[PDB]
Amino acid sequence: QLSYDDINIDIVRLNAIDFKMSWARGLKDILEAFEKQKVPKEVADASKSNLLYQQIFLHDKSVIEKEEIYDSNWLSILSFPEELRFHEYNWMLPKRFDVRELTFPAVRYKNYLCTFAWAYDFTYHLPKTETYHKSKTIRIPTEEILSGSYDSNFIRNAECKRLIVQLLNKAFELRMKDKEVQEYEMSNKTAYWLEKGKLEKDKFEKTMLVGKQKDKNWHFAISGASKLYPFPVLMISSHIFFTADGKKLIDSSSVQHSSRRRQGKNWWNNTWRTKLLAFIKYLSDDDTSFYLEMGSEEKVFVSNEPVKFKGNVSYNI
Amino acid sequence: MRNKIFISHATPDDNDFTRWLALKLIGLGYEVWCDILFLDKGVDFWSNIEKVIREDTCKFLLVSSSYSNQREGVLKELAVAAKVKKQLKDDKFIIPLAIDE
Amino acid sequence: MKELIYIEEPKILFAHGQKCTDARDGLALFGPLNNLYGIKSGVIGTKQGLKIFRDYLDHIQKPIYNSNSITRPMFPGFEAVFDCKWESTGITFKEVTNEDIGKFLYNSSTHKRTYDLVSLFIDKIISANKNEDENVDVWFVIVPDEIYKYCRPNSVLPKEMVQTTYNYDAQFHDQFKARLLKHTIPTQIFRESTLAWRDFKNAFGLPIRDFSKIEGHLAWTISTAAFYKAGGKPWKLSDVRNGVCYLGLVYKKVEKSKNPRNACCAAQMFLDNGDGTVFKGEVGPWYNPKNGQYHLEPKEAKALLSQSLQSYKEQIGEYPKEVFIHAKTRFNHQEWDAFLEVTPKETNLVGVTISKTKPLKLYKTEGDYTILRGNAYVVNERSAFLWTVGYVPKIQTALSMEVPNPLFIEINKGEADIKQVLKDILSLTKLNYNACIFADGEPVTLRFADKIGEILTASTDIKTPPLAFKYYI
Amino acid sequence: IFRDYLDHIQKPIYNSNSITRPMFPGFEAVFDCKWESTGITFKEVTNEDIGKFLYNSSTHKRTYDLVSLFIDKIISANKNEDENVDVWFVIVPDEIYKYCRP
Amino acid sequence: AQFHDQFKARLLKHTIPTQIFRESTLAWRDFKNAFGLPIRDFSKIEGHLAW
DNA sequence: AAAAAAAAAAAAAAAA
RNA sequence: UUUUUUUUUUUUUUUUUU
């Protein structure tokens, strides 16, 4: 309620330290003037007083505006197939057969085999399919599926995009198998770690991926996950698993969990990001992207560089 | 209502000119306040000046001189005049007077 | 490169109308909102457990130093920060003989042992409440360390010490705080290790619970908890707009009855006539059959919303203008239809879904440092990702330890301004009264509701439960 | 009226004959206790609320209604409010005292 | 049919200390009779009331 | 009897 | 349970297919 207009004359001359909105910034200005004007100060306790002086400036650490680029764990997908093919194998495909053992990913929907591959890629596993007719294909322009335009009685947008993350997930699994790594089965997911000696000195690029800690050998591991809701991307999550002799994983849950706690205690952002990107660069097929094997001629190019973001705020140590 | 014309000046030296101008203006019926003439004794002089400037001073007259440039009193009364100028929204509130060649 | 914008820090109110971002520093200098003249404390436990309590209280009466004061400011004294007295004199103490605590503990059945240990405490506390003249604001019960070893679910008592109810869960804490609801007795649980750790030592010679450096933080988190249980307001929100109640639903299982039955609970937060922010739970637990439904039936949903809205008219008078319902699980249309019918015409209902499951982890280009807290990548008008946990330079480190996992915000139902929602969840992370920390990883509605749900799922005989957080945290 | 009386008894009060009955030297001085009018738990009871139940023919049910109308509020304040009450000072009107007794 | 006994009888399961105050026992100065004097006048007795 | 994408509950260790 | 956080065991449902 006190505007500067109605101040007293002798005080009108004097510059005033403002307390109106904040009572802390005013005391900040008072102390700033006090060391500026060299006001005598008995140091006294020298500990509580120092704590209060530090506390008042909470102010040493504030929002500062500088652009800061960020790296995510999302692998951008660069390309997709032309068509979503539903081949009518029907009796050519035996009912009591597993779709998981097929060379390329393939999910069975009704009487249609759903895959991104063409008709006769699968002769070796299914010899009965040599007499198939390509006019039975229910190929769909996948880009329309990503847009969401295509909806019909044959398949729904929710049920036509849920089959793309499944098939792409088995594509990642088969690709990671092609890289010849051992696996640590999870309760729900699957994560893949690289052997001891498979890499030169167990270190790719400039970053070690397998190292020693006492008698417990830790292995950096990742998992794959494709989801197409915001963007077409491949979610990758870092993981740490252990082996007693470098190859045989420890079956004890508590021991492994405690060990991961021990290493993660001292593994910061530049210790996780660099290892993750180095392992991804190992998984790369070229300098910019990698492909997953889902058919003889069709391939999905997933970029090896994680999706970058941009933030308007940064900080310093 | 504001119907007073305060005269800012240095009271020891510029008193002659201030008194003369005040007497001339009161001869013209313009109400004039001067610390040499219209200031009351035994009162808070700074507060009285503050009330006169904020409430009753219609116009502010500054006698600018080689002394009136750098004295604290003329500076404070000038600053309060500037505040009243801002509040009244009158761009011609302060009319300085230059007397020293 | 995808743009991400940063919500301004949720910034909390203090005494005299003074405002400070940090809660610990705000209490350390400006004090609490309201005046508690003095705290009447009652102690139930053994004599050896009373000495450690008195010593720890004497310790926390004086200022206590933290190793790194910049990371965590020290505790300058309870009488200085809460301008209230809480000393060791005037405490109503209750004896618990070692023979009694050993006779019951060494039992073959965990359910019987936990029920009997809970009874041995609650019965004597009830007798003190009903039979004695002395008034106790908050009751501090001391429990030994062997109980934590052998009074919890899946804890097997060693054969060598086996010397010698099933409708209740095997946890001591939930049973203890649930069976005391009918008598409105606020009680806080202390471990004798949570007390002066220095006595208990491991084989190496260093004590297992190393609290030497971070004693100040424990002092802060016990002092604020005691003040909250004493009847005071530590800090309040100032960015909350009027006419908006929030409510938080978390689904907990129930094992006493066949099928989990999915007890449902809510916590209310909104603005009251004036400026005071009223944060109370909404506990009318609505049991939800089926093993894995996690969706309210229309009748229970309508009831929950009816007592939620009546809780606002009863002390403000008019209907809320825009409700923002938060939850850990997505809403199906059936409960939304139940909601809309009860919801009046002016009230705008919003359902917001929050999840920790989504594996998004932003990695900074160079350096041993992570993302800030408050950064938000927005996907669209309906979905976004906000890092409620992360670096705030005031704490100079993270509230998490690894790279934090941001919350997945999705407006399942209603329209809502997405940025308006993201300016409130970060705010909802500040009102953690059970712990004196900068903020919590997830909104306090879904945390206090989670706690009250984990407590109301322990006792069979709860009827008309109490809706205050004093009896739960 | 309660606030006025609390302020009054905060200050010391004098009786007519100090020999017959001594003065009260103030609550804070007598009991070494702080008890001010600031920070008092208040739960309002509407005059319409105490009028609806009061104007009843039978004393039993009207008394039950008046008793419930206060006990429910007290228990709700105990069970659902952050603020703590050492004592609950229940002010009652005089018309109730006239017409809510046997 | 009395407020006092029932009131502190039903609050027993909650163990809440209470004090029943009549508006007359409080600042009676408002409460007046036809003759104009307070019916319950404790002008000389107010010290005992405080005690 | 799977699938993936979503759920909670409890256990163990180390920090704040 | 003074807290908090990250994990690993399990476990379960829903929508669909034969």
PDB file of N, CA and C in Angstrom, chain A residues 149-181:
ATOM      1  N   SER A 149      -5.622 -43.261 -40.829  1.00  0.00           N
ATOM      2  CA  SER A 149      -6.734 -43.164 -41.769  1.00  0.00           C
ATOM      3  C   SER A 149      -7.448 -44.501 -41.935  1.00  0.00           C
ATOM      4  N   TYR A 150      -6.693 -45.593 -42.018  1.00  0.00           N
ATOM      5  CA  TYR A 150      -7.284 -46.884 -42.346  1.00  0.00           C
ATOM      6  C   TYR A 150      -7.979 -47.499 -41.138  1.00  0.00           C
ATOM      7  N   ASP A 151      -9.290 -47.692 -41.256  1.00  0.00           N
ATOM      8  CA  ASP A 151     -10.067 -48.412 -40.258  1.00  0.00           C
ATOM      9  C   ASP A 151     -11.158 -49.180 -40.988  1.00  0.00           C
ATOM     10  N   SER A 152     -11.345 -50.442 -40.606  1.00  0.00           N
ATOM     11  CA  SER A 152     -12.296 -51.298 -41.304  1.00  0.00           C
ATOM     12  C   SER A 152     -12.752 -52.461 -40.434  1.00  0.00           C
ATOM     13  N   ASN A 153     -13.625 -53.307 -40.984  1.00  0.00           N
ATOM     14  CA  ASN A 153     -14.034 -54.515 -40.277  1.00  0.00           C
ATOM     15  C   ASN A 153     -12.892 -55.516 -40.194  1.00  0.00           C
ATOM     16  N   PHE A 154     -12.004 -55.518 -41.194  1.00  0.00           N
ATOM     17  CA  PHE A 154     -10.884 -56.452 -41.175  1.00  0.00           C
ATOM     18  C   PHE A 154      -9.979 -56.193 -39.979  1.00  0.00           C
ATOM     19  N   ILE A 155      -9.674 -54.925 -39.707  1.00  0.00           N
ATOM     20  CA  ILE A 155      -8.789 -54.565 -38.607  1.00  0.00           C
ATOM     21  C   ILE A 155      -9.106 -53.144 -38.161  1.00  0.00           C
ATOM     22  N   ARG A 156      -8.870 -52.879 -36.879  1.00  0.00           N
ATOM     23  CA  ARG A 156      -9.098 -51.575 -36.275  1.00  0.00           C
ATOM     24  C   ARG A 156      -7.768 -50.864 -36.076  1.00  0.00           C
ATOM     25  N   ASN A 157      -7.822 -49.527 -36.070  1.00  0.00           N
ATOM     26  CA  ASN A 157      -6.608 -48.735 -35.884  1.00  0.00           C
ATOM     27  C   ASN A 157      -5.863 -49.130 -34.618  1.00  0.00           C
ATOM     28  N   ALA A 158      -6.586 -49.342 -33.518  1.00  0.00           N
ATOM     29  CA  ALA A 158      -5.949 -49.810 -32.292  1.00  0.00           C
ATOM     30  C   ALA A 158      -5.362 -51.203 -32.482  1.00  0.00           C
ATOM     31  N   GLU A 159      -6.078 -52.072 -33.189  1.00  0.00           N
ATOM     32  CA  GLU A 159      -5.641 -53.442 -33.415  1.00  0.00           C
ATOM     33  C   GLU A 159      -4.793 -53.598 -34.672  1.00  0.00           C
ATOM     34  N   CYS A 160      -4.592 -52.525 -35.435  1.00  0.00           N
ATOM     35  CA  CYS A 160      -3.700 -52.548 -36.587  1.00  0.00           C
ATOM     36  C   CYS A 160      -2.357 -51.903 -36.275  1.00  0.00           C
ATOM     37  N   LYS A 161      -2.292 -51.074 -35.234  1.00  0.00           N
ATOM     38  CA  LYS A 161      -1.040 -50.519 -34.752  1.00  0.00           C
ATOM     39  C   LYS A 161      -0.440 -51.311 -33.601  1.00  0.00           C
ATOM     40  N   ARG A 162      -1.248 -52.077 -32.866  1.00  0.00           N
ATOM     41  CA  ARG A 162      -0.740 -52.967 -31.831  1.00  0.00           C
ATOM     42  C   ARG A 162       0.001 -54.163 -32.410  1.00  0.00           C
ATOM     43  N   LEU A 163      -0.293 -54.540 -33.652  1.00  0.00           N
ATOM     44  CA  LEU A 163       0.423 -55.613 -34.323  1.00  0.00           C
ATOM     45  C   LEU A 163       1.757 -55.161 -34.900  1.00  0.00           C
ATOM     46  N   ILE A 164       1.981 -53.856 -35.033  1.00  0.00           N
ATOM     47  CA  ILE A 164       3.241 -53.333 -35.545  1.00  0.00           C
ATOM     48  C   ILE A 164       4.301 -53.267 -34.458  1.00  0.00           C
ATOM     49  N   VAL A 165       3.914 -52.949 -33.225  1.00  0.00           N
ATOM     50  CA  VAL A 165       4.840 -52.969 -32.109  1.00  0.00           C
ATOM     51  C   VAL A 165       5.193 -54.389 -31.680  1.00  0.00           C
ATOM     52  N   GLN A 166       4.279 -55.347 -31.841  1.00  0.00           N
ATOM     53  CA  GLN A 166       4.607 -56.745 -31.585  1.00  0.00           C
ATOM     54  C   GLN A 166       5.599 -57.282 -32.609  1.00  0.00           C
ATOM     55  N   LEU A 167       5.268 -57.150 -33.894  1.00  0.00           N
ATOM     56  CA  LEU A 167       6.134 -57.654 -34.952  1.00  0.00           C
ATOM     57  C   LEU A 167       7.495 -56.972 -34.921  1.00  0.00           C
ATOM     58  N   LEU A 168       7.520 -55.658 -34.692  1.00  0.00           N
ATOM     59  CA  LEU A 168       8.796 -54.961 -34.594  1.00  0.00           C
ATOM     60  C   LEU A 168       9.575 -55.415 -33.364  1.00  0.00           C
ATOM     61  N   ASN A 169       8.872 -55.798 -32.294  1.00  0.00           N
ATOM     62  CA  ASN A 169       9.567 -56.283 -31.104  1.00  0.00           C
ATOM     63  C   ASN A 169      10.243 -57.621 -31.359  1.00  0.00           C
ATOM     64  N   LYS A 170       9.542 -58.568 -31.991  1.00  0.00           N
ATOM     65  CA  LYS A 170      10.212 -59.813 -32.363  1.00  0.00           C
ATOM     66  C   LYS A 170      11.290 -59.573 -33.415  1.00  0.00           C
ATOM     67  N   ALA A 171      11.132 -58.540 -34.244  1.00  0.00           N
ATOM     68  CA  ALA A 171      12.200 -58.192 -35.174  1.00  0.00           C
ATOM     69  C   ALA A 171      13.452 -57.755 -34.427  1.00  0.00           C
ATOM     70  N   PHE A 172      13.283 -56.929 -33.392  1.00  0.00           N
ATOM     71  CA  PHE A 172      14.416 -56.553 -32.554  1.00  0.00           C
ATOM     72  C   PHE A 172      15.015 -57.766 -31.859  1.00  0.00           C
ATOM     73  N   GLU A 173      14.167 -58.672 -31.370  1.00  0.00           N
ATOM     74  CA  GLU A 173      14.672 -59.859 -30.686  1.00  0.00           C
ATOM     75  C   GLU A 173      15.512 -60.716 -31.627  1.00  0.00           C
ATOM     76  N   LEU A 174      15.020 -60.935 -32.849  1.00  0.00           N
ATOM     77  CA  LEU A 174      15.761 -61.733 -33.820  1.00  0.00           C
ATOM     78  C   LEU A 174      17.047 -61.037 -34.252  1.00  0.00           C
ATOM     79  N   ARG A 175      17.007 -59.713 -34.418  1.00  0.00           N
ATOM     80  CA  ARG A 175      18.224 -58.971 -34.730  1.00  0.00           C
ATOM     81  C   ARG A 175      19.252 -59.109 -33.617  1.00  0.00           C
ATOM     82  N   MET A 176      18.805 -59.007 -32.365  1.00  0.00           N
ATOM     83  CA  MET A 176      19.737 -59.053 -31.249  1.00  0.00           C
ATOM     84  C   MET A 176      20.305 -60.458 -31.097  1.00  0.00           C
ATOM     85  N   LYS A 177      19.493 -61.472 -31.408  1.00  0.00           N
ATOM     86  CA  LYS A 177      19.995 -62.839 -31.503  1.00  0.00           C
ATOM     87  C   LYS A 177      21.035 -62.969 -32.610  1.00  0.00           C
ATOM     88  N   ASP A 178      20.812 -62.291 -33.738  1.00  0.00           N
ATOM     89  CA  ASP A 178      21.766 -62.338 -34.842  1.00  0.00           C
ATOM     90  C   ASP A 178      23.112 -61.760 -34.421  1.00  0.00           C
ATOM     91  N   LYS A 179      23.104 -60.852 -33.445  1.00  0.00           N
ATOM     92  CA  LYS A 179      24.343 -60.310 -32.903  1.00  0.00           C
ATOM     93  C   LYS A 179      25.048 -61.285 -31.968  1.00  0.00           C
ATOM     94  N   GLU A 180      24.428 -62.430 -31.671  1.00  0.00           N
ATOM     95  CA  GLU A 180      25.069 -63.523 -30.936  1.00  0.00           C
ATOM     96  C   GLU A 180      25.479 -63.099 -29.528  1.00  0.00           C
ATOM     97  N   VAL A 181      24.488 -62.745 -28.717  1.00  0.00           N
ATOM     98  CA  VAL A 181      24.703 -62.423 -27.318  1.00  0.00           C
ATOM     99  C   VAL A 181      23.927 -63.414 -26.463  1.00  0.00           C
TER     100      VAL A 181
END
